Curated annotation (Swiss-Prot):
Entry EC number(s): 3.4.23.22
Active site: residue positions: 35, 199
Protein name: Endothiapepsin
Class in the EC hierarchy, top level: hydrolase
GO molecular function: aspartic-type endopeptidase activity
Similarity comment: family membership: Belongs to the peptidase A1 family.
Cysteine pairs bridged by disulfides in the record: 255-290
GO biological process, one term: proteolysis
Annotated catalysed reactions: Hydrolysis of proteins with specificity similar to that of pepsin A, prefers hydrophobic residues at P1 and P1', but does not cleave 14-Ala-|-Leu-15 in the B chain of insulin or Z-Glu-Tyr. Clots milk
Domain Peptidase A1: 17-328
């Protein structure tokens, strides 16, 4: 089997992407944030504290003939950005882009933090990291990909995120029309439960490439590119007037700037992030200070190749017995 679904930016900045997902019978379609940095499929639901729901579409398990309470199971997650959610668990039929999994754990939120409530466009998350990170207790549950894998034509999914435009998540096949050149594959460590890999270096603008190993995670659920302070300083030093602002929470730059590109290495290959991808716009409405899309990972504890990096590439998440990651230009 295969599946193919369009993923759409939630706003003009590509702060996140939503993908429609069919849950239950008859189908209830919710728009979920596909997140290769976590491993829970959770939704706003009829059980979510009413004051914490503000415009989201909810899953109502009582209206699904295939929903079953997973008795005794609870979940609770906290994300890198400080947001969180928790609740109980149903199993139900879940389909993405024509690919159907029966008996998928659908984690129903009883509580969500303010960041979730305040974003009316995201109805939940669909985790695509390794199932070892799944938070369901006392019986850990499998991700949608893990459940689908054996049925897929090939044990892979791909992320093709757009810059200020829709893109695609495919399951079970590689669309050879969706990228240019060849795909370069690189080793993955699953030791921390992430799609963790090592970039071979970077360049800033038309500058020379610096060969240096940068361990990090391919994370579709993180907006920005978080790299070591040395790398980030080298980038922003090429933008007149750019500075790190403790009050704003990272590097800002004059909105009048033209940003240089940023290149990262994948083996001997190179992925170029155009400068425009690094512009996250005014820090507040009307401001002439703009927020940067490359930020320091210092004090996160891990480097994160988030959407800013991934949307410059066609990315293969290869879930074969020994997983790997592939990157192509597009």
């Amino acid at each position: 089997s295969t599946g193919s679904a369009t993923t759409t930016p939630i706003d003009s900045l590509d702060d996140a992407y939503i993908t429609p997902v069919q849950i239950g019978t008859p189908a209830q379609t919710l728009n979920l944030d596909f997140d290769t940095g976590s491993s829970d499929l959770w939704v706003f639901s009829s059980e979510t504290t009413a004051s914490e729901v503000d415009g989201q579409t909810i899953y109502t398990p009582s209206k699904s003939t295939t929903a079953k309470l997973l008795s005794g199971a609870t979940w609770s997650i906290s994300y890198g950005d400080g947001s969180s959610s928790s609740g109980d668990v149903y199993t139900d039929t879940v389909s993405v882009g024509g690919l159907t999994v029966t008996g998928q754990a659908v984690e129903s939120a009883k509580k969500v933090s303010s960041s979730f409530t305040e974003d009316s466009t995201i109805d939940g998350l669909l985790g695509l990291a390794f199932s070892t990170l799944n938070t369901v207790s006392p019986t850990q549950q499998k991700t949608f990909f893990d459940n689908a894998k054996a049925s897929l034509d090939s044990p892979v999914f791909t992320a093709d995120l757009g810059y200020h435009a829709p893109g695609t998540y495919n399951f079970g096949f590689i669309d050879t029309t969706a990228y240019t050149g060849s795909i370069t594959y690189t080793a993955v460590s699953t030791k921390q439960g992430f799609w963790e890999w090592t970039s071979t270096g970077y360049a800033v603008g038309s500058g020379t490439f610096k060969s240096t190993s940068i361990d990090g995670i391919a994370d579709t659920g993180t907006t920005l590119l978080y790299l070591p302070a040395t790398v980030v300083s080298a980038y922003w030093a090429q933008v007149s007037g750019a500075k790190s602002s403790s009050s704003v929470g990272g590097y800002v730059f004059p909105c009048s700037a033209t940003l240089p590109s940023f290149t990262f290495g994948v083996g001997s290959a190179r992925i170029v992030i155009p400068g425009d991808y690094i512009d996250f716009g005014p820090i507040s409405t009307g401001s002439s200070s703009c927020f940067g899309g490359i930020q320091s990972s210092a004090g996160i504890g891990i480097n994160i190749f988030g959407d800013v990096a991934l949307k410059a590439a066609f990315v293969v998440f290869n879930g074969a017995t020994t997983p790997t990651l592939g990157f192509a230009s597009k």
